[PDB]
Every structure is written in C-alpha cells, then in structure tokens.
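WARN  no MSA supplied for this record, continuing single-sequence
INFO  ligand: chloride ion
INFO  echoing inputs
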Amino acid sequence: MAVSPSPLRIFTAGGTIDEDYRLEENGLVVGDPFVAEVLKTARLAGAVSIVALSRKDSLDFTEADREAIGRAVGQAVEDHILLTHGTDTMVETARYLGGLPELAGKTVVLSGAMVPGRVGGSDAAFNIGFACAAALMLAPGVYIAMHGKVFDPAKTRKNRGLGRFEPIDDQ
Amino acid sequence: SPSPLRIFTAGGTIDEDYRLEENGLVVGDPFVAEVLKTARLAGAVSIVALSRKDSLDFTEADREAIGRAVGQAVEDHILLTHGTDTMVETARYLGGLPELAGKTVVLSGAMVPGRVGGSDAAFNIGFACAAALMLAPGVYIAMHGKVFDPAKTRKNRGLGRFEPI
Amino acid sequence: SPSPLRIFTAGGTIDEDYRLEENGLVVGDPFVAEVLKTARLAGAVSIVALSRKDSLDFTEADREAIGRAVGQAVEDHILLTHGTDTMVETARYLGGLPELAGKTVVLSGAMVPGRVGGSDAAFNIGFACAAALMLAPGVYIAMHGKVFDPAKTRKNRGLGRFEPI
Amino acid sequence: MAVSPSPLRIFTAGGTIDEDYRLEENGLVVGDPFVAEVLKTARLAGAVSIVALSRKDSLDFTEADREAIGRAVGQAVEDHILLTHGTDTMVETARYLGGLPELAGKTVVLSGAMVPGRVGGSDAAFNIGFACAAALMLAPGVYIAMHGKVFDPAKTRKNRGLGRFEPIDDQ
Ligand SMILES: [Cl-]
Ligand SMILES: [Cl-]
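INFO  complex generated
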C-alpha cells in the first residue's frame, strides 16, 4: 500500500513571523511557531515534522544559538529543510550554515515574515508556501526565500527601514 | 530577480464568496490578487482574469480557449488558478499542446474558499508560485504541498483531494 | 456584575461553514461560542444548542418547542441566535407567550456567516448581548445596530435586511 | 419617506484597540481607528459619524488631550456617545468626563480592547457591538463597557497585569 513520503523537516527559531500579543507585556512577544498554523490547514499529502529550536528575541540570539541550529539541521535525516527565523539576522545565519560541510547534500531554505502571522495583512502564509516548495525543488545549498524569490545569502542584505531583502550588486 | 510570472484566473472554490442576493457562495473576485497584495513581491507579476464559470461547466471549447490564452503570454512561467473539479482535465489538455512546450504551467486552487476561515488558499498560492518559477517546462498540478503529474492524477470528489492513479 | 445570560443557538447563516463533502456551506458549530471565547467576559453565560436546521424548515411545532426551551431557563436575559429567514416568525411567536413575560429575549444572527470574511456576526453578538442585558422584558430583534419590534418588522429577502413595516 | 436617525457619534483617542504593526518601528504603533473597520461590515440601518481626536501613545497623553476630548463630547449634537480609548487611563478619562455638567443629558460610553483589533483573537469587535448598544440604551451618565458588562468609573480600576477592569468593592 502506498506510503506518502515526508521529505521536508521544518525548524523554528522565532522571529517576527511568530510574534503575538501578550497582555502582561502590553505588546508583542515571540509566540508559538506560526508555520504550524499554516501547515495545519494546508491539507498536506505528506506530513511535516516541525521542531522548535528557539524563541529568543533578536537581541539575546547568540553565536551559540546559531551553532545549535547548524547541529539540528546537520543531524536531520531529511535532505530538504525549512528554517523559520527573524529577518534582521537571517543573512548571518544563512552564511553560517553555508559553511558547514555536513549540509552539502541538503537543500536548506530560511524564511519568515516582515509582518507577524497573527497580525492582519501578513506575508507569512504565502512565504511558508513558497519556502516549502523552494526547499523541495532547489538544488542543494543554503537560500533565503522571501518576496516570492530566492536570494543567495553571500549576495543579500536586509534593508531594515523598508522590511525587504535586496541583492548586493556585483561590481 | 525571478523570471516574470503570468497568473490566469479561471474561478473555482478558491475565489468563492458569500452574496446576500444568492443566500450563498458565488465565484467572486480572484483570491490570488488578495494573497499577492500582502506578499511584498520583488519580481514581475501580472494577473489576468479568464473566467468565473463553475469548472464543471467547462467544455472542450473552453479548454481550447484557455490553451490559446496561455499561449498569448510572453512569460514562460504561468500559474492558472482553477476549480478542482476539472483541474485534471484542463491540465492534461494543456500538457498535450506543443505551442506550450517551453512554458512551466502550474494549476492550483483551494479545497476551501480563500474568504472562509481555515483555507489552504494562501499556502497553495505561495507553493504554486514557487513551482511555476522552479519546475522544468511542463504542466503540473500543485496542491497539498506537492507536485502532481496530470496524466497520473485524479480528483477524489468524495475525499476533497488529488491522488495518484 | 451583569445578570446571568443564557444563549440558545438555533442555527442560521451566522453558523454556516464550508464542508468539502457538501462542496459548500452547511450549518456548523455555533459561531457565538467563538466570539464569546475571545470576549474576556466578566459575567455568567451559558450556551445551549437547540437546532442546526435551516430556519425556513421551522414548523409551528418547532417554534412551540423553542418557546418551551426558553421557558426552561432560570435566567431572565436570553439571546437566541437564529436564521434571518424566519427570525420575525419565531420572535412574534415568543412575544405572544405569557410564560416569557418577565424575560428579556433578543433574537440575532448575521447576514454573512461568521466564518466568512467581512461578517457582521461579531458586532451583532456584542450588540445583542448588551440588548439582552439592558432592555426591559419583551422580545426583540437586534440586527443592523438597532432594536426592532417583531410585530412591526419584516425580513426583506432580496435586500438582506430587516425593515419597519 | 422615512429618514433613519443616526443617534450615536463615535470619537477615537487611540489605544491598544487601534494598534497595528509597522516595518519602520519593527513593532506596534497606534494606527487608524479600528472601530471604523468594525462598523464598515456591521450593515448598519443608520450611520455613525466617527471622529478621530488623537492617536498619541499612552505616555504622551496629557491633561490637555483629556480636556480636548471633553470639549468634543460636549459640543456634539448627539446625546449617545462612544469614545474608543486605551485601557490603562480609561478610568481617569471617564472620571474627568463625569465631572462636566455639559455632559449631563448624554450617555457617554468608553470602550476599547485588551488585544489590538488587527491581532488574531481580539475582543475588539464584540466590545464595539456591546458598547454601541450600551451608548444607545443606558441612561445619561459616563460608563466603561468592557468584558460584556458596564462599569461605574468611580468604582472601577484597571488590573494592568491581567488586562481586566475590576470593581472597587464598597467597604
Ligand atoms: Cl510591540
Ligand atoms: Cl453555498
């Protein structure tokens, strides 16, 4: 009888995508992983394991946290990986992962959202669909998937003011 | 940049909305435009309306007109949003057209209207836009977080899903 | 505190939801419970399910059973969520029952299902809960941000609204 | 031919109810008035004039701002008034308005939301429905309408930690 394969694993490191309002803080905190909400209603043929690695706010996120993400991605059986993450340091994590030889036969995609998923008008659900497809279809490597396109982490910056990733032009 | 994408809308469950005059759902404005409005896209996209007919009412003549319309696009990356009832019929017909052989054509839609809570539509649109950009030339169905070969796929009406034959 | 409120659910557009098996809307779980879950209430509320029938299918016998059910409540403040097609018929029938004469009974619902985008349901529920707490004993329809006298009201099916006669 | 009366006027002073995410701030700001969004889809028989008075964040809100709200409410022709406002100083504004003899024949209700309207799971739409009804049905006075009940501002406090208004018990 046919067994539907589950080629994709998702890891979550928090970020804007997962932010939610809490009364105590009178403001946003990093909440539960929004990617789980999106996949719950995606009516998937397979299944996707979603493993939560970290929810630190961006200021507290360290090298040691980035090392733990590399160990988790490297230890996964799956060769197709989506990491949801904050956009302010996504490029630094992507560049770090691109240097691990352990990742050489894996397609690893980083994504997230400029607007929290739990806020009206969020990019999150589109971005998760696009990034899931990217993780399945791209050749091995490390990529950022945002704005409905694929970015090379070595040639990308975050424009903090505009909430967009932009290519670094070759000179 | 990504390659320019052309999106055609042929109606279906994805676009259904409630109307007081009908006391129920009717095919309304294309939901894909609502999703892409907030997707903060970098690439070139253009959305064109083909139809708001029920996909069950499509004739062979209708499918021939959808094929000619996809062939009017310069773009080589195409998304067609469509009802799931006859998505396999339209997809198999397009896959037979030599005039489309250099294009990546992806059909998608939703099992639950985009304007109803808990819909698959926004995820499906993201997934299918990536698929239209990234897959080799051909015709495909992108639903349920996977890519289907139309020749080897059927719509299970009772289970609300696509399945391998 | 406010006086305890009892809420009865009799179905209707407010509670409609999409089902793949029907390829369309059916009366689902009461939407009023979804609204009150996030309303952070201070007062006593209890929600009881009466029916998920189409309001057009209500008989005189059904309206008599709704009257007896409202009379089983100790509470003197009652909200009944209901379809708009026969809301005036149920409301006029309840207004004729001496056994309800000390109760404030408010009927409400929605023109657009709560689970569809752009629905009036959550505003209607807030408004009707206030109305059930604050109005003098009687039977009322609370819709469109106002209070209607059932005896002097009709459902315009074509315009999707209630109106004075 | 029948003219539908419009007995209710709404004023907006910002608060949590109106908060929205902005990329530049990387967080919530006081946005456009959420009550307008709720009434847009309420299918009203009448109309409601919605007048925006202030969007200051809570720290910048002063006595002079509170005085301007009292002048706007007193000058309105309508005798049924809903003021949407922050919950942290709603009691102080309500007590201030309760002391204006100019308001004596008006029903004035203050409301808002513990969770921004543009965040998932908000109380805002319910609260606006309830508070509109309260403004129409209550006898003249100044009230807070939250948690599906009516509070007397002289006998109410905000519990900041729990996001709730509570009665001050008579001793
Ligand atoms: Cl914030
Ligand atoms: Cl329907």
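Strands of chain D lie at 8-12, 19-22, 27-30, 49-52, 80-84, 107-111, 141-146, 149-151, 156-159, 164-167.
INFO  checksum written, moving to next record
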